């Protein structure tokens, strides 16, 4: 089976470990948690039943009996213990985004590629079936030639108080605009933006508010998004070219409708678990089927999400951000 | 009654002439028709039961019975008949685009200025129960304060031959952005844009293809539109603040579907006339009740597209076309 360590005891490590803990028990097991306390993580590991707690990252970086570390903190604490775990010899899955900035990034990649190690950004929504589907959509080329791709992701989130933290960087773009960047990359293939055109706005917490972007993509097809941590949105998702338009439904960033020329799909989530802290949070199962696909075949990272890649969509989302004089001490 | 001449015997002519004579005959009259030449004129008032028919338009901008003239030639013959009828001295609707740049629309403007006789653009849009419902919501405040409005409206029209043909000024944005400014504009109070970004690209018969566009707007707001006449868009329009979004739903440049804040409300079109060559065709009566109501109050304008908004509409939009180097004779 494919041994998971958890590192940090939060809201999505608990979605993600409820997940795992739904899965064949011969591919996947969860070894080991830890917290920045011993308290919290035993507490963690009594309530999803986990047979080892740590209360540092760095100890369960050593553990010889976890293969792959999931790390789930807060988005500056990704960095340092991503970096940990690798240097340990352990494959990450960190959650999104990897980094606060491109050179953070740059770093973990550059340290996943040194050691021959495993290392992917969990952008989750890149393995619901739905998405899956209008992939395969635009390789059988069903919507003609392309011409443009539009996404938003936006609600009130001010009441959140992780969202709008300067300290934590939040805001619109680091919290939503990666589900708008991600979609746009994957519709054109990945390919680097030739120019980016940004309006927005700050928050009175230190964070970006709300933000529009237009991309100029090669081969003369363009995309936009708009993200908001105070205006709701469609939080939807589209492409469309000469012959007609695909769709993903609200919720765009953990889809289960597709709709192609006017035709409806529907992809349900597994059944279990139920009341995630998250909506749709049973969609992580897609994620982590994936990793372990991965390395049952010695991959050293994900085609879906390639790590160049995940420095491209860093590299766009920080270029977005500077356009609008939003800065991080990282910087 | 109000006693309406029509200039030209096109498509949009029928539509609007037959929606006229579904209106009360105390209030609404054809009483001439003009096209450029007398048998197509007179087939036209057989058809329509028109009283007088002319073989020029100059004929009708001179007919002493006629007090509005509807210009519904293509675009770049609106405003020779505008200029036309306004020096014989009658109040004109022209359809939209008024002119095919900005310099057409100001010396429109500026003639009926100078003669103080009534002049609108026929944005038909503004009129429908959808569109006043939507700017009641913007008044109470509803959405909070505002954040960012979007509008769509793409469809593939390359086989009407007129949508892009370059000599009778087709394309995207005068066929169907047009809809989106005029729209972004409305939600924005009529102000003028502080900075304009556009992405887009030709198409093979000379007119823009597809096109983006971000407007800065002031007080920290912005829009974005795309339209197309190539690929299919989701026609709708939006605009979201701190407390809620308000859309208007497929088809957004007719709507009769409004949703706020998640609640839905239908606006039912008048019951005829039925099988009108342009999708909900009924709804132009809406703008032709309105004009007699300026008329009867003696207005030279529209409050609702006042004459240095349509102006301003045409302004950018010259602007947006001109940044993807897409020019006409007339400019």
């Known amino acids: 089976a494919l041994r998971w360590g958890i590192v940090s005891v939060g809201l999505i490590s608990s979605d993600f470990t409820a997940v795992l803990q739904t899965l064949p028990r011969s591919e996947h097991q969860v070894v080991a948690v830890a917290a920045r306390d011993l308290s919290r993580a035993k507490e963690f590991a009594q309530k999803h039943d986990i047979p080892k707690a740590y209360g540092s990252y760095e100890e369960l970086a050593k553990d010889p009996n976890v293969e792959v570390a999931y790390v789930g903190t807060q988005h500056p604490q990704h960095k340092a213990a991503v970096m940990l775990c690798l240097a340990a010899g352990k494959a990450v899955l960190c959650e999104k985004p990897m980094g606060v900035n491109a050179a953070e990034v740059r770093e973990m990649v550059t340290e996943a590629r040194s050691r021959g190690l495993f290392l992917m950004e969990a952008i989750w929504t890149r ?5 899956e589907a209008l992939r395969s959509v635009l390789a059988q080329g069903t919507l003609g030639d392309l011409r443009v791709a539009r996404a938003e992701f936006g609600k009130n989130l001010t009441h959140v108080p992780r969202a709008v933290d300067w300290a934590q960087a939040g805001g619109a ?16 293939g990945g390919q680097k933006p030739e120019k980016i055109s940004v309006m927005g706005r700050r928050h009175e917490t230190g964070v970006d508010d709300t933000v529009t972007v237009l991309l100029q993509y090669p081969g003369e097809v363009h995309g936009s998004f708009t993200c908001s941590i105070t205006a709701q949105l469609s939080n939807t998702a589209s492409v469309s070219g000469t012959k007609g338009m695909a769709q993903l439904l609200n ?3 953990c889809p289960t409708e597709l709709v192609v020329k006017g035709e409806h799909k529907e992809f349900l989530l597994p059944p279990v678990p139920k009341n995630c802290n998250f ?3 049973a969609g ?3 994620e982590a089927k994936h990793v372990r696909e991965c390395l049952r075949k010695g991959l050293k990272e994900s085609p879906v999400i390639p790590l160049v890649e995940s420095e491209l969509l860093a590299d766009i989302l920080e270029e977005v951000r500077r356009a609008i004089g939003v800065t991080f001490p990282q910087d």
Chains 1, 2 share one sequence.
């Open 173 to 188: 773009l680091l919290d939503l605009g990666i589900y708008c960047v991600q979609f746009i990359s994957m519709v054109f």
């Open 127 to 131: 393995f619901f079936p739905a998405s």
């Open 279 to 281: 909506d749709n949070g």
């Open 284 to 286: 992580m199962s897609y």
């Open 251 to 253: 919720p765009c960033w």
